[PDB]
Design a protein around this ligand. Structure first.
Ligand SMILES: OC[C@H]1O[C@@](CO)(O[C@H]2O[C@H](CO)[C@@H](O)[C@H](O)[C@H]2O)[C@@H](O)[C@@H]1O
Ligand SMILES: OC[C@H]1O[C@@](CO)(O[C@H]2O[C@H](CO)[C@@H](O)[C@H](O)[C@H]2O)[C@@H](O)[C@@H]1O
Ligand SMILES: OC[C@H]1O[C@@](CO)(O[C@H]2O[C@H](CO)[C@@H](O)[C@H](O)[C@H]2O)[C@@H](O)[C@@H]1O
Ligand SMILES: [Mg+2]
Length: 580
DNA sequence: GCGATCAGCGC
DNA sequence: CGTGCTGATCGC
């Protein structure tokens, strides 16, 4: 039966109590400068629905929203906070965010709406958002009666669920993680997203023109060498040309056909001149379609800024993700793509971009957690970790390490940092699974502490059912007991990797909170723009660079205290590209 | 229109 | 046989 509530035509005092579940509904997935379709408030006085036009124009309600002493419980408060920021309204006092609470309790559940979170506690008196709004082209805000009941039911669920969610977090020893880390970070992410990053669109357009030129040249060359025209961007069509018309060997196949991935094309290059051209085409095409045209599509015409959205409740490792646009994967490895970064500039005249990154934070975290004497000593001496790993696994002095040895040691470390299988390592180094496994073995012989940790963490995951990070983030691994070798092995690798990657996530998140506190104490105009897993990107007046060179690295390095030092490198320049 | 498949970017 | 995200193609 329907849920009782007052569909108010004006704001009343009882709607402004010092404790309430609040819903400020933004239906558009991208909430930047998006519409607020409705508001719901549930407190000790009852349940209320308010039309945005009314509430947001009412000075009492606005003041209530901005009053830090008036506590609010919400679901995805960042969405509401940002939508309100675009309307010039401040949201304060959010003491509980159900989305973040559910995320910390179990990232694997994929909770993306109130209904999903509520179902965790057998509460189902609320509908999934998709059921109410639909999806895709059929998505739309329903009539007021339907909308009002939905927002009220969501607010009611939040009101009822706060206590049980907080109680379980306390049992998991995650209450501080929510209240002292994720919730405060949510507000910082809101400011970053709202600020956005300025884009030199003319620069991007110029690069695009140039790429279009090169693409046309290589495209014709490809048809030339192929003896016919075909859709190069079609793995299917390309596969027929390469493996049927040109008879190149089939070294790898996909579930549906011939593989044409770069790793495969690399091996085929010697056989035909068309290959190198296909590779060149893939590189330029990726830049053109994804980084030039893609970025240009989401830049705001009025300010020339891009406003990403950081998904704080998605990854199972505790990392943040970025969308519309994704600003965590802008090219940097190859010089060609790297130039894309020249397009990201300061948002004000005479300001500069400042970037600071942790040096090998994942392996330092591993040295700390595993308490491996060799690895800890390596970082205490601040050694080149890849040269050092090569020295130990290949049993040679430092001057005996060749470039190829270091490359292979670096690939092994990559595998450790990301928890890839011996198969993954074999493909990465183009060697046999046996040889790959062989390197792993040599690594454990030289880093016995790491081997002990891996064995111990796997047993711990099996016994408790989950693994944890430095700040108590948790990840359940039900597959660790599977009688299927591949499935179980993956779970075991995640058991060892999550504490590493997840703790690194915990650290940079706390650094972000500590940094903003310091920037405020110092009254610096500098502010965060982006987080890219192990690095922070800021912009600030050129006159603040010297102070940032000392402040940023220090705050980041001191975020937590490990058995080994943390080290942060930094650079600044006129564009993101120049902050190298 | 929309999901599946394949590709490649940085972490 | 680490991952999330985005874009081009392809078949229903
Ligand atoms: O507001 C971000 C927050 O919303 C969720 C759903 O609760 O994701 C939605 O919004 C994202 C940003 O536009 C989209 O990428 C995603 O597809 C959409 O469902 C959460 O996952 C996220 O933390
Ligand atoms: O000129 C466009 C026309 O060419 C084809 C090949 O016959 O595709 C080419 O151009 C596309 C757009 O630039 C690329 O995506 C593709 O990789 C390239 O081969 C046709 O599909 C298209 O109609
Ligand atoms: O030989 C023991 C060694 O094998 C691993 C897998 O690499 O774990 C296996 O053996 C354990 C018993 O000691 C089981 O609990 C586990 O499920 C099974 O895969 C290592 O963790 C262990 O050191
Ligand atoms: Mg780094």
């Amino acid at each position: 039966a329907k849920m009782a509530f007052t569909l108010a035509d004006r704001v009343t005092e009882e709607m402004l109590a010092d404790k309430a579940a609040l819903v400020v509904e933004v239906v558009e997935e991208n909430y930047h400068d998006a519409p607020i379709v409705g508001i719901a408030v549930v407190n000790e006085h009852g349940r209320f629905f308010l039309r945005p036009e009314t509430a947001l124009a009412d000075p009492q309600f606005v003041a209530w929203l901005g009053d830090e002493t008036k506590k609010k419980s919400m679901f995805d408060s960042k969405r509401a906070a940002v939508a309100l920021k675009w309307k010039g309204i401040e949201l304060c006092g959010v003491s509980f965010d159900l989305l973040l609470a559910a995320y910390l309790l179990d990232p694997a559940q994929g909770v993306d709406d109130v209904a999903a979170a509520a179902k965790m506690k057998q509460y189902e008196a609320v509908r999934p958002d998709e059921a109410v709004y639909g999806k895709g082209a059929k998505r739309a805000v329903p009539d007021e009666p339907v909308l009002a009941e939905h927002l009220v039911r969501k607010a009611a669920a939040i009101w009822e669920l706060e206590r049980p969610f907080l109680d379980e977090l306390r049992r998991n020893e995650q209450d501080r993680l929510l209240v002292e880390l994720e919730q405060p970070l949510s507000s910082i992410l809101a400011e970053m997203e709202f600020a956005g990053v300025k884009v030199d669109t003319k620069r991007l357009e110029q690069m695009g023109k140039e790429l279009a030129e090169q693409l046309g040249t290589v495209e014709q060359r490809i048809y030339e060498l192929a003896g016919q025209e075909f859709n190069i961007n079609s793995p299917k069509q390309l596969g027929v040309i390469l493996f049927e018309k040109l008879q190149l060997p089939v070294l790898k196949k996909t579930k549906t056909g011939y593989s044409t991935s770069a790793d495969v094309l690399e091996k085929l290059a010697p056989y035909h001149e068309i290959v190198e051209n296909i590779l060149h085409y893939r590189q330029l095409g990726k830049l053109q379609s994804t980084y030039i045209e893609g970025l240009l599509k989401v830049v705001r015409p009025d300010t020339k800024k891009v406003h990403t959205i950081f998904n704080q409740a998605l990854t199972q490792t505790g990392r943040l993700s970025s969308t519309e646009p994704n600003l965590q994967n802008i090219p940097i490895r190859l010089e060609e793509g790297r130039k894309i970064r020249q397009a990201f500039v300061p948002s004000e005249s005479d300001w500069l971009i400042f970037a600071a990154d942790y040096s090998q934070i994942e392996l330092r975290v591993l040295a700390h957690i595993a308490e491996d004497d060799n690895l800890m000593e390596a970082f205490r001496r601040d050694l080149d970790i890849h040269t050092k790993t090569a020295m130990d696994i290949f049993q040679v002095s430092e001057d005996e390490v060749t470039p190829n040895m270091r490359r292979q040691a670096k690939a092994v470390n990559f595998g450790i940092v990301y928890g890839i299988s011996d198969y993954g390592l074999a493909q990465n180094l183009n060697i046999s699974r046996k040889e790959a496994a062989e390197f792993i073995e040599r690594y454990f012989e030289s880093f016995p502490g790491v081997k002990r940790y891996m064995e111990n963490i796997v047993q711990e995951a099996k016994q408790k059912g989950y693994v944890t990070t430095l700040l108590h983030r948790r990840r359940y691994l039900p597959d660790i007991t599977s009688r299927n070798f591949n499935v179980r092995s993956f779970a075991e690798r995640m058991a060892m990797n999550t504490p590493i990657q997840g703790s690194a996530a915990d650290i940079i998140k706390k650094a972000m909170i500590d940094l903003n506190a310091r920037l405020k104490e110092e009254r610096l105009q500098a502010h965060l723009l982006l987080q890219v897993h192990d690095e922070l990107i800021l912009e600030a007046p050129k006159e603040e660079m010297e102070r940032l060179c000392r402040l940023v690295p220090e705050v980041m390095e001191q975020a937590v205290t490990l058995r080994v030092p943390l080290k942060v490198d930094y650079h600044y320049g006129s564009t993101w590209y120049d902050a190298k």
